Amino acid sequence: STAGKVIKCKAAVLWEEKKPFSIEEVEVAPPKAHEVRIKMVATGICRSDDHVVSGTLVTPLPVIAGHEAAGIVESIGEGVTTVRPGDKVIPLFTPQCGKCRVCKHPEGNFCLKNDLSMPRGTMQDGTSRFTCRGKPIHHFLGTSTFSQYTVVDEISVAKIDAASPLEKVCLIGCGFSTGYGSAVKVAKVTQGSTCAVFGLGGVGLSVIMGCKAAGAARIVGVDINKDKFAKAKEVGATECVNPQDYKKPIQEVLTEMSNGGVDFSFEVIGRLDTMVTALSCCQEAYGVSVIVGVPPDSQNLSMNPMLLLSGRTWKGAIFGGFKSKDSVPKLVADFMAKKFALDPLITHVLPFEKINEGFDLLRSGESIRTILTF
Amino acid sequence: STAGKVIKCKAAVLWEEKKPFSIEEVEVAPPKAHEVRIKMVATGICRSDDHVVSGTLVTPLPVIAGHEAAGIVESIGEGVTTVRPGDKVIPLFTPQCGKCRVCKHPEGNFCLKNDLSMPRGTMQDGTSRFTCRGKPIHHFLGTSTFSQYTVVDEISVAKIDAASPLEKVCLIGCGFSTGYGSAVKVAKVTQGSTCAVFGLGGVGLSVIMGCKAAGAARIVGVDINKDKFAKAKEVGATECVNPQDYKKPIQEVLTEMSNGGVDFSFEVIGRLDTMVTALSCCQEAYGVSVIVGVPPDSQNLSMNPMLLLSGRTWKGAIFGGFKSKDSVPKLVADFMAKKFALDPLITHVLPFEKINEGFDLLRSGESIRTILTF
Numbered sequence: 001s002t003a004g005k006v007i008k009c010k011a012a013v014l015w016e017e018k019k020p021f022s023i024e025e026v027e028v029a030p031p032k033a034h035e036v037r038i039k040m041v042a043t044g045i046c047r048s049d050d051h052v053v054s055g056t057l058v059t060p061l062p063v064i065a066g067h068e069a070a071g072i073v074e075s076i077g078e079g080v081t082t083v084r085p086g087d088k089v090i091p092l093f094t095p096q097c098g099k100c101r102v103c104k105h106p107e108g109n110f111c112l113k114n115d116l117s118m119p120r121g122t123m124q125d126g127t128s129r130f131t132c133r134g135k136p137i138h139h140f141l142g143t144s145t146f147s148q149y150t151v152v153d154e155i156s157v158a159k160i161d162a163a164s165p166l167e168k169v170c171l172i173g174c175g176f177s178t179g180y181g182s183a184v185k186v187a188k189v190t191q192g193s194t195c196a197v198f199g200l201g202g203v204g205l206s207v208i209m210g211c212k213a214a215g216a217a218r219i220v221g222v223d224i225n226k227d228k229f230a231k232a233k234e235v236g237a238t239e240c241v242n243p244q245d246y247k248k249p250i251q252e253v254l255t256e257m258s259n260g261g262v263d264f265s266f267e268v269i270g271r272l273d274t275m276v277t278a279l280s281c282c283q284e285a286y287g288v289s290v291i292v293g294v295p296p297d298s299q300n301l302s303m304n305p306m307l308l309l310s311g312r313t314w315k316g317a318i319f320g321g322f323k324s325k326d327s328v329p330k331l332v333a334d335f336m337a338k339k340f341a342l343d344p345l346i347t348h349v350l351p352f353e354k355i356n357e358g359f360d361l362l363r364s365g366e367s368i369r370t371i372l373t374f
Numbered sequence: 375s376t377a378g379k380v381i382k383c384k385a386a387v388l389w390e391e392k393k394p395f396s397i398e399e400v401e402v403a404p405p406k407a408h409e410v411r412i413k414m415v416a417t418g419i420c421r422s423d424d425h426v427v428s429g430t431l432v433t434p435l436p437v438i439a440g441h442e443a444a445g446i447v448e449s450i451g452e453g454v455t456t457v458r459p460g461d462k463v464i465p466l467f468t469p470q471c472g473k474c475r476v477c478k479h480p481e482g483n484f485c486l487k488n489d490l491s492m493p494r495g496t497m498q499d500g501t502s503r504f505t506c507r508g509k510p511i512h513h514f515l516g517t518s519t520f521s522q523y524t525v526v527d528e529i530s531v532a533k534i535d536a537a538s539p540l541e542k543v544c545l546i547g548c549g550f551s552t553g554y555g556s557a558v559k560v561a562k563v564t565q566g567s568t569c570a571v572f573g574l575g576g577v578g579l580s581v582i583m584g585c586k587a588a589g590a591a592r593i594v595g596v597d598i599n600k601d602k603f604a605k606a607k608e609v610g611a612t613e614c615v616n617p618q619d620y621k622k623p624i625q626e627v628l629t630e631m632s633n634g635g636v637d638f639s640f641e642v643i644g645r646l647d648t649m650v651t652a653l654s655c656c657q658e659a660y661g662v663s664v665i666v667g668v669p670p671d672s673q674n675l676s677m678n679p680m681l682l683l684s685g686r687t688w689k690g691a692i693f694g695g696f697k698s699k700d701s702v703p704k705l706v707a708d709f710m711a712k713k714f715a716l717d718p719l720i721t722h723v724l725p726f727e728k729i730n731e732g733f734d735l736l737r738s739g740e741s742i743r744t745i746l747t748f
């Protein structure tokens with residue numbers, strides 16, 4: 001049995017920014033009240049995890065990153081009611097405490113218990129369950145999935161279908177649900193509309209899937225890497241454009257393509273300039289633009305508010321606007337019911353020990369999602 | 375017997391920025407095809423008119439300003455079908471051509487024939503109906519209401535109830551419809567919500583009216599002029615705050631007062647800093663902020679897009695999101711049915727000849743709306 005005991009296991013520890021992950025032994029404490037210790041099965045490499053390494057995102061170091069994953073419950077702390085040992089689960093990087101004003105709000109999903117806005121890199125109780133070489137190691141978004149075992153607060157875990165393929169549905173922990181929800185729930189893309197999607201990685205392909213699902217007539221993919229176009233067309237893009245191919249700003253190209261501006265645009269990269277471009281390419285009176293990409297820490301954009309005064313709507317979301325604990329098991333159920341596909345997002349499947357090579361595939365432009373298997 | 379003939383009349387010509395208006399004779403050409411010549415009865419002084427004087431709003435000079443008004447049709451050009459001589463009418467500074475992609479969209483109102491985005495200061499045909507001292511004078515937003523007679527394109531005028539009191543209903547041509555629509559149609563304020571309204575002039579008072587109509591529990595007026603508070607309370611503010619009273623920035627004050635941010639915020643001033651503050655003060659995950667105020671020409675704001683990524687929605691609108699020609703007669707009908715009050719906005723009445731004193735009143739902070747009578 002491991003229950004009630006410290007587990008020594010392998011994890012990918014990030015000791016400082018802009019360095020490879022260190023794959024080594026850590027000690028994982030047993031779960032305290034209302035906590036859940038999970039044996040990881042599969043975790044995806046999300047660009048957000050790369051932002052921690054690059055310093056685009058500031059979070060306390062050293063850290064066990066990873067937030068897109070699935071695993072199997074090893075043990076539960078006293079008080080846990082929503083999962084049990086042996087359950088398949090997906091950690092929730094946006095929690096759902098169910099009691100805060102946001103949780104109670106019918107649209108809101110950015111639960112006030114989150115560790116995103118002012119990251120502490122701890123459990124809800126302000127402490128860490130991880131040590132490495134005698135030192136405490138921070139958690140990341142309450143999840144820390146780049147470990148053979150993690151401990152999460154109950155509000156940061158969802159039970160999923162026992163028959164789920166964990167090496168696919170781990171994507172429901174971030175990339176798929178974020179893109180898909182951004183289209184269907186946040187933007188509320190309409191039938192027959194014209195959509196533009198900036199950034200054709202795992203998240204942007206998922207936005208395309210959502211736009212297609214919502215019945216868009218036109219879905220224009222935008223990326224500087226033309227290698228990403230063929231997959232974007234496979235999942236629903238009607239045409240792809242590379243800004244580098246044009247003498248004019250791409251907002252102008254998109255406005256002409258769409259005969260006056262698009263219905264819905266999505267920034268799915270994380271650049272200040274493309275957030276403004278995305279806003280500008282939506283139709284001035286009724287367009288809607290959604291920010292999905294994570295921008296570099298503490299940097300402001302500049303824009304002209306007349307872009308909004310004419311009628312545009314600008315919004316952003318975390319995790320596709322989904323209330324995380326209610327939505328994740330439904331999304332897995334829908335996948336099992338063949339309502340959407342995940343295979344088009346998966347380009348590479350590596351063992352966990354090859355985490356660094358996975359991140360190099362991302363950084364080189366070669367991968368969409370690499371799934372690491374424990 | 376004035377039909378088909380040039381009319382000489384007095385108008386208030388603005389020859390140069392930052393100068394008084396010159397009340398002097400102009401010649402008003404007869405209407406061309408699909409144009410309407412209107413004998414003005416009453417016109418309100420809106421801060422946007424003052425923006426033309428200050429250079430906050432750039433539009434070609436010399437100009438006949440004025441956009442918030444009502445009058446009586448003197449004559450119609452060939453092909454006009456929607457009004458007739460002797461009809462009571464409100465000029466529509468935002469037109470409704472009924473044919474463009476915006477006019478056809480269920481939620482758009484910023485008709486593509488507008489003269490607001492890139493002002494020419496002409497009629498739809500690119501020419502002027504106005505001469506003064508033998509010199510052509512520009513139109514403003516297709517309305518030019520600071521004249522005893524104006525000529526407007528048919529898509530820039532609405533027939534209203536023959537029994538309407540024009541010295542009141544002129545406010546439906548801008549200030550009232552704008553603020554009220556901004557709350558009820560653009561923001562879609564909900565029952566029991568907390569609203570914050572930045573700027574307690576005619577438009578922000580109309581926003582308050584709208585929020586109270588929509589059933590908001592709390593409506594916080596924000597103004598640096600505490601003289602504006604009493605009227606704001608009369609029309610529904612539950613509490614008023616002056617930023618100059620506080621050591622902390624007002625977004626933090628509003629966030630505290632609202633136990634984590636308001637449901638709806640409105641910028642009804644026209645400053646870049648208060649556009650950002652107003653966004654910031656709405657709840658980070660599900661707050662909605664609406665820009666109503668008109669910013670200084672060509673200036674950009676600076677903001678941190680993480681304010682959106684958490685879940686905020688930012689939008690703007692012209693004329694409260696109302697499709698102008700459809701809405702104005704319905705708004706007048708509802709006023710006549712006492713569905714809303716216009717008297718709380720009218721603080722001063724003057725003859726047209728005292729237009730400059732009317733502007734002095736607005737500039738001093740003493741008036742809300744001054745109505746000028748021809």
Ligand SMILES: NC(=O)c1ccc[n+]([C@@H]2O[C@H](COP(=O)([O-])OP(=O)([O-])OC[C@H]3O[C@@H](n4cnc5c(N)[nH+]cnc54)[C@H](O)[C@@H]3O)[C@@H](O)[C@H]2O)c1
Nearest residue numbers: 047048178199201202203223224225269270293294318319
């Ligand atoms: N809001 C959320 O909850 C949420 C969740 C998941 C991911 N993210 C963010 O979303 C963004 C995309 O994530 P991902 O899909 O995993 O990243 P990714 O796989 O790196 O994809 C980004 C795509 O953007 C492309 N790109 C880079 N620069 C430009 C440019 N100037 N113009 C057009 N394309 C460009 C690039 O070629 C790549 O295909 C990142 O910033 C993530 O941090 C946000």
Ligand SMILES: NC(=O)c1ccc[n+]([C@@H]2O[C@H](COP(=O)([O-])OP(=O)([O-])OC[C@H]3O[C@@H](n4cnc5c(N)[nH+]cnc54)[C@H](O)[C@@H]3O)[C@@H](O)[C@H]2O)c1
Nearest residue numbers: 421422552573575576577597598599643644667668692693
């Ligand atoms: N979007 C539209 O269709 C539309 C329509 C009508 C009016 N407008 C604009 O809306 C704004 C309001 O117009 P109005 O109500 O006629 O103007 P107004 O009567 O000048 O009211 C503005 C109010 O803002 C207050 N104010 C000024 N500075 C600050 C500050 N820093 N903090 C708090 N309050 C401050 C000021 O004391 C005044 O009571 C102006 O910019 C207009 O041009 C927009």
Ligand SMILES: OCc1c(F)c(F)c(F)c(F)c1F
Nearest residue numbers: 046048049067116174294318
């Ligand atoms: O990809 C999900 C994701 C985000 F959307 C963030 F805003 C963030 F800060 C983060 F760490 C993260 F993982």
Ligand SMILES: OCc1c(F)c(F)c(F)c(F)c1F
Nearest residue numbers: 420422431441490548668692
């Ligand atoms: O007050 C209404 C109004 C506006 F909302 C504008 F954006 C504008 F440019 C203008 F001239 C105007 F009069």
Ligand SMILES: [Zn+2]
Nearest residue numbers: 097100103111
């Ligand atoms: Zn919560």
Ligand SMILES: [Zn+2]
Nearest residue numbers: 046048174175
């Ligand atoms: Zn992610």
Ligand SMILES: [Zn+2]
Nearest residue numbers: 471474477485
């Ligand atoms: Zn139109």
Ligand SMILES: [Zn+2]
Nearest residue numbers: 420422548549
């Ligand atoms: Zn106005």
